[PDB]
Amino acid sequence: LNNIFEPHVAVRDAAKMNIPTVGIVDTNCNPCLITYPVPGNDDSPLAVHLYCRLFQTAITRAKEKRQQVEALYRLQ
Amino acid sequence: TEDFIKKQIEEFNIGKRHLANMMGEDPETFTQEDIDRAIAYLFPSGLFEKRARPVMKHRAIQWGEDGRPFHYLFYTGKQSYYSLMHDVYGMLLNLEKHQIGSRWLIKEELEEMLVEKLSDLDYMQFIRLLEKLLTSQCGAAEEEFVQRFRRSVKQLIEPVQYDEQGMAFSKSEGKRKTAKAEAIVYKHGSGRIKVNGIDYQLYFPITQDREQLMFPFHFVDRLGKHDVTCTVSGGGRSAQAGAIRLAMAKALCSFVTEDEVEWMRQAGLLTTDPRVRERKKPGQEGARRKFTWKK
């Protein structure tokens, strides 16, 4: 949601451009156009920090696993 | 891309070597100033706009060959400005957690620094953030950051000389309208002023000109304490009087204290009057007088 509680225009734009969108949707959000909606609180600092940590860890794990797989294939 | 820039760099190096060969200079110590001088000599162009003259000299792209942008704030479209704002906000957070002749650069200077284009409101936001940083009792690590965005906002005095006769004197010059005067003021004298070898009361029958000549010495309370020889050419009586006044004040600056020099500068005795005759323009009677508007 933007600062006027309407859905972010980026959601509609990404749907137009066929970009998959993960999204944290609160009770007042609109998960219709979000590819992978995660129903959760988006206002509490603890919840936002947990989401940031989770996505950071997922991306870092994915990148390091990609490096490991590429190195292992090179050593094959 | 970067390949084109690298090709241009190699071409510039080769051309610099050729230019050094042509001018006979050492190709090693052939610097940019030498390049500019050689180009100006070899291709003499008198175009007033210096950007249009011949020049031999040394924006980028924000993503690599894989398409991944280098800056994590690239998709904002203003990555430099928002990165700067992010760093400033981080510094403010750190300061909060732990606890003149300078001005802010103009929007054009900020855009040049950040090689981007910024709106007035963005500039105002950044300036307000910088002011909040300054007022937050920021340390030297942030004071240098502020001084990155800070921009700085006295009259030189001629030295005393000595003549054949043994007197100690100073010499200066001034101008007013189309009159130029050169004055020589001796450290010791009796108030005698001679203009073009003629005594001032004879060369300046008008009392106003004599008052103008008196003004500098009277201001610093030095009437009769010096002897002055002036050579003035051009202009009329009042222009000559003003030029002599300015030259005498500038020369007398060499004998009064620095405080008196500042007082004279504040009194206008040292500023050269830029008011000169304005040129007549076609289609009007004078400089500003339009013709009689018929109906």
């Binding site: - | 002749g101 106003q208 008052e211 201001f219 007082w263 504040q266 009194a267 206008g268 500023t271």
Partner: protein
């Protein structure tokens, strides 16, 4: 103007720069410190630091000037002052001691007092010719212009400007003459139009 707005008008006053540091207030000290970083316009050819420099007389001379003939206007002004002083000296020497005490002989004082007496307190402007108050600058300008116009009147024939101006200044010093009458007529007209002044 060839001067950029950064420039500031010069302050030609020796007493200002001779004031001791201790007497300076915090605001005055700040102003003096700021002036060290400000560009100052060149001193105009009119005003100097001379102890005899009278801004009122300089302004009157400028108003009397016709076609940039400053020399002639200054000569007329000094001749007027000399004539006023000579007439006052003649009156003093021709009068008894009791009258001699009252008789004033300073030409500058007489000039200033005459201009002050000729100052119209209230004037009139269209809005109906509504009587309206006048700022002090307008008052002084009106007094000077009235004196100059009255002296330039064709009613006087073959008489030089210094003599006429001296006579009118002496008349105004005693609250008489055509200029004081003009001021009183203006005030009478304002009193008459008091009714319409509510516009």
């Amino acid at each position: 103007s060839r001067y950029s707005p950064e420039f500031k008008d010069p302050l030609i006053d020796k007493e200002y720069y001779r004031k001791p540091v201790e007497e300076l207030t915090e605001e005055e000290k700040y102003v003096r410190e700021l002036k060290k970083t400000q560009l100052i316009k060149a001193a105009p050819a009119g005003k100097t630091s001379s102890v005899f420099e009278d801004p009122v007389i300089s302004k009157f001379t400028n108003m009397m000037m016709i076609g940039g003939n400053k020399v002639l206007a200054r000569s007329l002004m000094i001749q007027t002052l000399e004539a006023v002083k000579r007439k006052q000296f003649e009156k003093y020497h021709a009068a008894s001691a009791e009258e001699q005490a009252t008789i004033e002989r300073n030409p500058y004082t007489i000039f200033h007092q005459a201009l002050k007496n000729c100052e119209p307190m209230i004037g009139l402007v269209p809005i109906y010719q509504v009587p309206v108050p006048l700022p002090d600058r307008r008052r002084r300008f009106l007094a000077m212009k009235w004196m100059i116009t009255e002296c330039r009147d064709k009613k006087h024939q073959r008489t030089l400007m210094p003599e006429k101006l001296s006579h009118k200044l002496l008349e105004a010093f005693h609250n008489q003459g055509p200029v004081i009458k003009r001021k009183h007529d203006l005030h009478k007209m304002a009193e008459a139009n008091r009714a319409l002044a509510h516009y």
